[PDB]
């Protein structure tokens, strides 16, 4: 269990937490604003998934400051997580390419 597989695994777990908490915080922030469609938990969870994966169909979109602020956190946490995995996959491939040589 090296670092790159530990961080990537921890990123996946953290991403799940952000998706769940993001759904809760989105509804809590979007309600009270007339015209907002992100006001129920199940679809807010679906919105979080297509937000963290960047994607963004447009069927659901935050219209409040805190609702959009939550979205930004979801985006970054999504991009970083899916990006931390790629960096982990590279370290795996690089470390094995040395084994196909003299290291």
């Amino acid at each position, epitope marked *: 269990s090296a670092l790159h597989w530990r961080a990537a695994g921890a990123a996946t777990v953290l991403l799940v937490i952000v998706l769940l908490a993001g759904s809760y915080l989105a509804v*809590l922030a*979007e309600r*009270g604003a*007339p015209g*907002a*469609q992100l*006001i129920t*938990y199940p679809r807010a969870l679906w919105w979080a998934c297509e937000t963290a994966t960047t994607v963004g169909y447009g069927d659901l979109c935050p219209v409040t400051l805190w609702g959009r602020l939550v979205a930004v956190v979801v985006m970054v946490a999504g991009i970083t997580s899916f990006g931390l995995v790629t960096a982990a996959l590279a370290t795996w491939f690089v470390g094995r390419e040395q084994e196909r040589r003299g290291h």
Partner: antibody
Amino acid sequence: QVQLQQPGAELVKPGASVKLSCKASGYTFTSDWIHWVKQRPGHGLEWIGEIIPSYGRANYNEKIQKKATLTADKSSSTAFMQLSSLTSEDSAVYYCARERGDGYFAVWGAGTTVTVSS
Amino acid sequence: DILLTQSPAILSVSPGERVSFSCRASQSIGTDIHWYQQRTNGSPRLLIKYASESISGIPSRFSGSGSGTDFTLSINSVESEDIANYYCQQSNRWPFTFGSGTKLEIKR
């Protein structure tokens, strides 16, 4: 079991105030929203406002005159609606309902018949 | 705010006949509409959630359909205990709104 409990009636004279209660039972999640619905005799349902006991945040209907204050109490699982400075137009039956956060009102209360007179 | 129009206000029907209630939204709300029932001096009771999804406890007599702006609550062969006020409620955009209501009466 009766999930939502409300007082039978509340008599208020114009200018005064009243604090209705909505003691809830059954499954109490963290995503539960307590709504309040006003219904005048002969008329239909009217959404007053909503509140989430978990966070304490409350939203209200903006199209009508705002004279309601929603507070909660997680210790006793009871929602409270504070009506201030009422007139004859505010005399109606006030229902409270529980929403699981999925849009619809699963269960309603018996409703509190608030009468405004001297 | 989304406006929900229920027409007609009073719906008269013979016993054992199929009756359909109407609910029209001022804008497309998908299937985020919900039907309720309120008898004389009673509390509203959920009949149909999300346009067509049925509720446990509610008789199979009730059914729902529609998508977008037009929705319909139907009762296959209406009986005496179905005499009440029927309201529709949307949950697509904040705030939640109700319909004007529709009175059902039986011509015995």
